[PDB]
Amino acid sequence: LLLQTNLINYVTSIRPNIFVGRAEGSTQYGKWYFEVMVDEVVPFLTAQATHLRVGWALTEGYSPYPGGGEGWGGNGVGDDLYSYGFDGLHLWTGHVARPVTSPGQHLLAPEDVVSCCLDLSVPSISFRINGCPVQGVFEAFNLDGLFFPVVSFSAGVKVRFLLGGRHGEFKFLPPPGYAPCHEAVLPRERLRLEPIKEYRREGPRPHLVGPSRCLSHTDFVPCPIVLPPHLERIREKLAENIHELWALTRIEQGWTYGPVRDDNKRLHPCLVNFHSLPEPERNYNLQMSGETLKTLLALGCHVGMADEKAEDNLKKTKLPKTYMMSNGYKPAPLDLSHVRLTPAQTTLVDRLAENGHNVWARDRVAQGWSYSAVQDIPARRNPRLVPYRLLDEATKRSNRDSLCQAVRTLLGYGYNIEPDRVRIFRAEKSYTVQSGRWYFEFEAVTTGEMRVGWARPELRPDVELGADELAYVFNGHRGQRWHLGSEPFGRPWQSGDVVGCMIDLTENTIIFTLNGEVLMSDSGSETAFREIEIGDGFLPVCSLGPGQVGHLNLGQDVSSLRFFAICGLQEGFEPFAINMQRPVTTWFSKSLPQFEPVPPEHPHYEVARMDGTVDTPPCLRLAHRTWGSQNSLVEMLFLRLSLPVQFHQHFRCDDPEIILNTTTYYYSVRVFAGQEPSCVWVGWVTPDYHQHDMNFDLSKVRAVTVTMGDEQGNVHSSLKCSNCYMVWGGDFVISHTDLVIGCLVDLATGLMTFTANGKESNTFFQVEPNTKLFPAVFVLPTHQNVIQFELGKQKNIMPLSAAMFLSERKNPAPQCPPRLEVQMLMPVSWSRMPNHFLQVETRRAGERLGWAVQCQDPLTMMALHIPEENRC
Amino acid sequence: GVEIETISPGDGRTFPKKGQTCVVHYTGMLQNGKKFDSSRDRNKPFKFRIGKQEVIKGFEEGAAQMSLGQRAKLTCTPDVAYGATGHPGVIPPNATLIFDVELLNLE
């Protein structure tokens, strides 16, 4: 009921860049495996347990932050549904503890090696430690994202990872078919150990970053008619000139004439011309020419046939004495010295190379080959099967200048051709000012999406910063106004700029400075806006986009300011930190979406509770008033009632005498007429729900099959950990009569079969006993008054008010308090960074040991539970 | 009836009998995942000896079966530790108690 607290740990997590994912036609193999060896971990440095476990997760939902979250506090792996954590005694997946039946079980002690094996097509997560696998696996999960290694470490942990065979050497040899992790590396990215969702790094003089943009799960997959008669023979002439350009650089470097073909002997069978080429070699250039002329009008490039005299007047290139080999024959390519490189088609032949060779990646993956940094012809391995903007630039011009010998040649032939989210970095509202004059700066080591300026403490992070009347901010990537519009003022940035803002609120002057020089507008005034009312005062605000670096210059010591002694030190301005005993804690927005209560003065949606009649009980429903014109953007709402029901702990294994002993309670929803029943989803959602997208459904929900057993392979029990135990409103369904979808919870055994219009459906689900579920519906409304929860009960089943709290469990009068009102998730909130973090560092000695992560900072933190929602 | 599960392997050499003082560096946590007791917060090892009827009988028989360096997990049913009402302000009546214990020194 009330709010308790205890001291809790700090956790962060480190992660290497091994990104493995699938689709329909994917570049993967499906088998990857790694180890971690444990040698330096403290037993108990802090009060609580040393949070130490390994696991793998997917990038879209798992995001550990040291401040806030669900549970007690200190959330790493195993603390959510996306990750699969295991410390040695219990397989943690979603705030659970499941016993594991292995001989000689213990936690991650030193001088042991901990690992897990994972495969991709059929789900299987097995764990491997101490020479014999443990008897517990996970399967049947959703893989809508990519894989990554990630570890959980508390204070006083020094561990190294056994990477592969290149920069490591595995003590445990893998089973046949399991490939090591060391070759799923992107070519232009060196294998880097970077923490997930970081917003702060330790620099030369603590600098803060934004979210690094993750590679999409629709990015690695390769995705790609008529025959004009005026380009038929010249499509073979272009293949013949391609054979000439094949032989021209070949005879100059060592390709000689020979009836055989050999790699080391440099023997060419096609060194004379295209006419001396055999039949399997001529149709190869013919099928390449056929593949490359069909994609001309596939984009919209208008090609016309004109100037028949110029191509005939163009002769061949001149041949030197040393340009022709010891064969006696010479190729005659067309000299494109009269052709010019165009910047318009230079941007198109950069895309046609991808258009021509992602179908090459298509065709190699359809034969069944995979991706690795090593190639191996018995294992059908190659570093070639990549998308083109994931390919490194060692292959870029070796592909494009090989194919660019045809496009300016067809030009000279006479044929003309025609052409996550953003974070907001701000202080707390108790550090604001109302009188005087202050100043900050901003150093921008990366020119990107920076927002610098000042704002108001009643800041709404729902609106994009710069579009409402709560912030007066500066643009510099384009350089203008952002307040109730946009109009030009100022200069673009430079990589390493110092930009700040000061306000003379004595006479409401806004002054932006660029490296000591003050900028003026198009009118000639160096000040930006006037006539600002003070009101609640200003707040130092900043905002950083996806994937850039830039820190907030506070100015505690005067010598740490560099560009304030040039401008503004004489006229009276002072830095913000005039009398500071401690560094300021500036809050920042999180891209973790969670729930926030309904304001009563909302211009879009309203809710209200009814009175209590005999025929209809006192209930609540939703209504929409701005349904019509004037920009009514309506989207799928996610209603919830903010209080849970916790079940019975150990299971059992009308007349008043039959209602007093049973534990089953039923509620329903009744959708009003004229609404789409296909987008109505009714049921119960656990607190493990931190996602928001615009078209969710029950195909996009995750459930992990947990089962354990004996060492011989037999099964013992099966367990399903899910977060969305709901159904489809259109499963049984301009309807004129309303329809009913119900949910009943039997607390004694835990089985939940949902009923519709007085008749039972087919889908059943069971949950672990010591979890809780919130009553929630996900409904897109297609008119005004749609959703109607009912606080009712039929002749043999008690309502929800009995299972609500303790003081009313056996009275069948259903009434609804204003403590329970509707709950809606908005995708932005405010959390806080602490003033001291975990200074982590990476080290390795030796070539086969592995890169080690260290920590040495002992840190604990006072954190609360609020057990009516379970959010630390 | 109490179920015991070890956590970290210890000695297996000395398990206590009558006439032996013992130190246990214990932590307590109920079945719904809430903290109620510890000696981590103390920086003191708890000192007692067996057979003085000091600890409750669901702990006095589980504390005589372990050894040095041994971390165990004991899940006490409510019938063996304050069945009827119990200590006011500490444990609600008939709730299971789960202790993860560690023996420090002194047999």
Swiss-Prot record, chain A:
Sequence segments annotated as region (Interaction with FKBP1A): 40-51
Recorded consequence of changing N130D: Impairs interaction with FKBP1A
Superkingdom: Eukaryota
Ranges of the Sequence repeats in the UniProt entry: 211-319, 320-419
Miscellaneous comment text of the record: Binding of [3H]ryanodine indicates that the heterozygous channel is activated by Ca(2+) concentrations 4-fold lower than normal. Single-cell analysis of cotransfected cells shows a significantly increased resting cytoplasmic Ca(2+) level and a significantly reduced luminal Ca(2+) level.
Function as written in the Swiss-Prot or TrEMBL entry: Cytosolic calcium-activated calcium channel that mediates the release of Ca(2+) from the sarcoplasmic reticulum into the cytosol and thereby plays a key role in triggering muscle contraction following depolarization of T-tubules. Repeated very high-level exercise increases the open probability of the channel and leads to Ca(2+) leaking into the cytoplasm. Can also mediate the release of Ca(2+) from intracellular stores in neurons, and may thereby promote prolonged Ca(2+) signaling in the brain. Required for normal embryonic development of muscle fibers and skeletal muscle.
Comment field on protein domains: The calcium release channel activity resides in the C-terminal region while the remaining part of the protein constitutes the 'foot' structure spanning the junctional gap between the sarcoplasmic reticulum (SR) and the T-tubule. Pore opening is mediated via the cytoplasmic calcium-binding domains that mediate a small rotation of the channel-forming transmembrane regions that then leads to channel opening.
Designated name of the protein: Ryanodine receptor 1
Curated annotation (Swiss-Prot), chain B:
Swiss-Prot/TrEMBL GO biological process terms: 'de novo' protein folding; calcium-mediated signaling; insulin secretion involved in cellular response to glucose stimulus; negative regulation of calcium-mediated signaling; negative regulation of heart rate; negative regulation of insulin secretion involved in cellular response to glucose stimulus; negative regulation of release of sequestered calcium ion into cytosol; neuronal action potential propagation
Protein name per the record: Peptidyl-prolyl cis-trans isomerase FKBP1B
Function, as annotated: Has the potential to contribute to the immunosuppressive and toxic effects of FK506 and rapamycin. PPIases accelerate the folding of proteins. It catalyzes the cis-trans isomerization of proline imidic peptide bonds in oligopeptides.
Entry superkingdom: Eukaryota
A matching Pfam family: FKBP_C
EC number per UniProt: 5.2.1.8
GO CC, any one term: membrane
MF terms (GO), sorted A to Z: calcium channel inhibitor activity; calcium channel regulator activity; FK506 binding; peptidyl-prolyl cis-trans isomerase activity; signaling receptor binding; transmembrane transporter binding
EC category: isomerase
Organism listed in the record: Homo sapiens (Human)
Keyword Isomerase found: yes
Subunit and interaction comment: Identified in a complex composed of RYR2, FKBP1B, PKA catalytic subunit, PRKAR2A, AKAP6, and the protein phosphatases PP2A and PP1. Interacts directly with RYR2.
Record keyword Lipid biosynthesis present: no
Lineage: Eukaryota, Metazoa, Chordata, Craniata, Vertebrata
Keyword entries, A-Z: Cytoplasm, Isomerase, Rotamase, Sarcoplasmic reticulum
Listed InterPro entries: FKBP-type_PPIase, PPIase_dom_sf, PPIase_FKBP_dom
Location(s) in or outside the cell: Cytoplasm; Sarcoplasmic reticulum
Family under the similarity heading: Belongs to the FKBP-type PPIase family. FKBP1 subfamily.
UniProt note on tissues of expression: Detected in heart muscle (at protein level). Isoform 1 and isoform 2 are ubiquitous with highest levels in brain and thymus.
Domain PPIase FKBP-type: 19-107
PANTHER family in alphabetical order: PEPTIDYL-PROLYL CIS-TRANS ISOMERASE, PEPTIDYL-PROLYL CIS-TRANS ISOMERASE FKBP1B
Activity: how regulated: Inhibited by both FK506 and rapamycin.
Substrates-to-products reaction catalysed: [protein]-peptidylproline (omega=180) = [protein]-peptidylproline (omega=0)
